């Protein structure tokens, strides 16, 4: 089996877990635990970290018979060639480029603000920008079913949980732009998805590492 | 013609523009100037940027015909997959996949500190990170002639641009791996890319914008 080496939080491993379960594919999570406080010890990672056989050697990690991938986009993108979850044509292949990067663009801006001891001061005005990201996820979607178009795509595993995490911080945060609501709702009705999330090996929560000021718990 | 807008520096547009010379693409630039002083002003920006039908408006941005894409990596994965320079087995797409986002990640390690206000007092701290990170690179490449084999592919170009900017900030960082030292050498004798670096156009500075605390010329 595959080896999803990764934190024991949700983290840049939500979307790589969802794509693992959804294609079905047969892995097994090396997780590694982060020390507590003042500290917050990585040495059950730092004392792995060089003896992978990994190029640039990080979390997450895939490691896949003869292949041995870091690099969370790196991951999804080997797994959806696997299984032909990329794009088909010139237009779907531009859509997942564009959104694979702004995903992760819009994902730093929110992590960004909680990594930050400012969280407090920062928080009112991240609040107030958050309208004008998720609109801008909206009209992109469009009437689409999924977010290259009508197939179902790895950056809809993206899409679903970067726009999972802005709506655990601001809960009403897609409730004027129904059909990101019914994109969230569709990707969560998928019978392997769903099942999965019904299962003991789901992991909701940390979001971020020990010592961020929001979603550490 | 395509139009390439970014501002007029360096930046995110470096691999592109090389990219598109490599390639022998007809492209315009569009540049963006920025204010000065305090309030560096971006209106001639602001003013275009929701007027041009971007999806996620953003600099740099491609106009090509249809297509009309924001973030760099999907710029060059757009002119890489119109001449044929991506990856081909799976295992150049992994390196590919991994030098690619592994080369953000340095180029933003890099840009964080060169943009804080602390720049001066974390610039010698930097300096002895450095070393490792290009040894990474160097075991990466190892005897390859380029970095996912044996055939030029527009992380290359990524990965030129990447190691560069370190080689401007630290002249010696390359000296104990004749590995990228050569690759340097390789890529800037590639005809059309001499033909380009040597012209009055090539824009090897200013590295960042101009409220950077170092390559801000
Ligand atoms: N761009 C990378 C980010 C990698 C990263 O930030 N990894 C964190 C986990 S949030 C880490 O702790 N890495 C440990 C290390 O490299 O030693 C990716 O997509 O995977
Ligand atoms: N992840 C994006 C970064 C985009 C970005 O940071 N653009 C900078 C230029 S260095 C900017 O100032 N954009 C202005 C804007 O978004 O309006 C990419 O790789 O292209
Ligand atoms: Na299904």
Redesign the pocket.
């Known amino acids: 089996p595959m080896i999803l080496g990764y ?1 024991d939080i949700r ?2 491993a939500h979307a790589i877990r969802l794509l693992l379960e959804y294609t079905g594919s047969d892995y097994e999570e090396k997780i590694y635990s982060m020390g507590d406080a003042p500290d917050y010890d ?1 040495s059950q ?2 004392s792995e ?1 060089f003896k992978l056989g990994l190029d640039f ?4 990690y895939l490691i896949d018979g003869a292949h041995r991938l ?4 790196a991951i999804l993108r080997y797994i959806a060639r696997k299984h032909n979850l990329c794009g088909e044509t010139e237009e779907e292949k531009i859509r997942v480029d564009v959104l694979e990067n702004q995903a992760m663009d819009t994902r730093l801006d929110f992590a960004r603000v909680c990594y930050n001891p400012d969280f407090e001061k920062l928080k009112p005005g991240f609040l107030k920008e958050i309208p004008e990201k998720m609109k801008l996820f909206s009209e992109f979607l469009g009437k689409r079913t999924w977010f290259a178009g009508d197939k179902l795509n790895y950056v809809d595993f993206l899409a679903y949980d970067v726009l999972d995490v802005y709506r655990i911080f601001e809960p009403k945060c897609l409730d004027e732009f129904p059909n990101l609501k019914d994109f969230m709702s569709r990707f969560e009705g998928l019978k392997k998805i769903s099942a999965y999330m019904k299962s003991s090996r789901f992991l909701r929560s940390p979001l971020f ?1 020990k010592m961020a000021m929001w979603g550490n718990k």
């Open positions: 934190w983290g840049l990585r990672w730092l970290k050697p990080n979390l997450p870091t690099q969370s986009n590492l």
